[PDB]
Design a protein around this ligand. Structure first.
Ligand SMILES: Nc1ncnc2c1ncn2[C@@H]1O[C@H](COP(=O)(O)OP(=O)(O)OP(O)(O)=S)[C@@H](O)[C@H]1O
Lengths: 50, 149, 50, 100, 50
C-alpha cells in the first residue's frame, strides 16, 4: 500500500514542487528500499520527506 | 516553506544558527521562546469579549515583522509543558501542520490566516519529551557534537 | 480607516467581514465601551500583513 | 446525518478525508480545530448582556456555510482538556446527541 | 429587515420572537447603547440559515 501510494500520489507531487519536470525518476525497487530501510512508521509523512 | 527541528546537546550552535540563516537569506527574523510556556492562550488568543484580550504570540510576531515570509525561531520546543494547567503542545498541532496551516485560526482574529510561507526553525535538546503527533510534522536535523580537531 | 481597509491586501471574505464591521461601527455613538472593542479589532485586522 | 470518529496512527489521512468527502458529495465544508481548547464559551456563546458577546464556533460555522447540511470536521477531539476549571467536552454532549 | 424576517425560514416560535424584538427596536432612539444590541441580535437571527 505504501508503494502504491508513493507511486501514484507522493512522488509526482514532490517532483512538481521541485522544478524537475521529467528530468528525474525513481524505479520500483528504489521506492521499496526507501520504504524498508529508511522509515519506521504507520503513515506516509516520513516517506514523503525522503 | 520548511519546518525543521535541530536536536543536540547544549553549547552547540543551535540558537545562534537561526539568526545566521535569516541573515544569509536577507529575510526578517523573530524569536519566540517557548520554555516554560504553560497556557494555551499564548498560541491562540482570547475572544474579543474579555476586557484585556489580544492575539497570541504568532499573530503578534507576524505584526512585528512586516512581511509574510519571515524566519521564526521557536526556541526550546521540548521544554513546553502539558500538565494540568494548560496544554500548549496541542495548540501547536494547528500551527506546524504542513498541509493545513494556510488556515490557522486565532481566537482574537476570527478569520483564517496564512502561515504557509514562514520558515520555522525549532530547537530541542532531546526528542523524547515531544508529543508524537507533533514530532511527526517536523523534519529532524541532528547536530552531533564536536571532536577535538 | 476605510482607505486603509481598501489598500492593504486582503482576501475577499475577510474584506467583506471588515466592511460589515465598519458599517456597524459608523452608526454607534463614539466613546462607548463597545465602540472601543469594535475599533481595536479593525486596527489588528489592518496591521497584520496580507 | 451520521456522526463519525476516525481513529488511527499519526500519518494516516484522517484530516485529509474531510475535503474529499465534502467535494465528493457537492456539499459545503468547514473546519473547526479543537485541541487545547479550554473555554466553554467557544462551544456556546455569552448571553448578549455582556459587552462584546457573540455566539460559539458552531453558530458561526453554520453562518459561514450557506446551507443547513454542511460537512463539518472537528479536528483532534481527544485533545480537549477537562478539569475543575475548563470543560468544553461537557458542552459537546449537547451538539453530538443523536436525538436531542 | 422586516422583509428579511418574513422571507428566510423560519419557525413560527422563532418568527414571533423576532417580530416582537423588531417592534421593540422600532421604538428606541437611534443611537444607542441598547439599540445596537437589538440590531446585532437581529442580524445574527436573519443571517443564520433556516
Ligand atoms: N491513502 C492515502 N492516499 C493518498 N495520500 C494519503 C493517504 N493517506 C495519507 N495521505 C497523505 O498523507 C498526508 C497526511 O495526512 P493527514 O490527514 O494530515 O494525517 P493526519 O492523520 O490527519 O495527521 P494527524 O497527526 O493524525 S492530525 C496528506 O498529505 C495526505 O494526502
Amino acid at each position: 500500500e505504501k508503494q502504491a501510494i508513493a507511486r501514484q500520489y507522493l512522488w509526482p507531487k514532490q517532483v512538481r514542487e521541485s522544478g524537475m519536470e521529467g528530468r528525474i525518476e525513481v524505479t520500483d525497487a528504489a521506492i521499496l528500499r526507501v520504504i524498508s530501510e529508511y522509515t519506521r512508521e504507520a503513515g506516509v509523512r516520513g516517506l514523503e520527506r525522503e | 516553506a520548511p519546518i525543521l527541528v535541530l536536536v543536540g546537546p547544549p553549547g552547540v550552535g543551535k540558537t545562534s544558527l537561526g539568526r545566521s540563516i535569516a541573515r544569509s537569506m536577507n529575510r526578517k527574523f523573530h524569536r519566540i521562546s517557548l520554555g516554560g510556556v504553560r497556557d494555551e492562550a499564548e498560541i491562540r488568543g482570547h475572544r474579543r469579549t474579555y476586557i484585556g484580550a489580544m492575539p497570541g504570540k504568532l499573530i503578534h510576531a507576524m505584526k512585528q515583522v512586516g512581511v509574510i515570509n519571515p524566519v521564526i525561531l521557536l526556541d526550546e520546543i521540548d521544554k513546553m509543558s502539558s500538565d494540568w494547567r494548560g496544554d500548549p503542545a496541542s495548540a501547536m498541532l494547528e500551527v506546524l501542520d504542513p498541509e493545513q496551516n494556510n488556515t490557522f485560526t486565532d481566537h482574537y482574529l476570527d478569520v483564517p490566516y496564512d502561515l504557509s510561507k514562514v520558515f520555522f526553525i525549532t530547537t530541542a535538546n532531546t526528542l523524547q519529551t515531544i508529543p508524537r503527533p507533533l514530532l511527526d510534522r517536523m523534519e529532524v536535523i541532528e547536530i552531533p557534537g564536536y571532536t577535538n580537531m | 480607516l476605510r482607505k486603509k481597509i481598501e489598500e492593504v491586501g486582503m482576501p475577499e471574505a475577510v474584506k467583506t467581514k471588515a466592511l460589515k464591521e465598519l458599517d456597524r461601527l459608523e452608526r454607534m455613538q463614539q466613546g462607548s465601551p463597545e465602540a472601543t472593542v469594535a475599533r481595536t479589532y479593525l486596527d489588528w485586522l489592518t496591521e497584520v500583513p496580507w
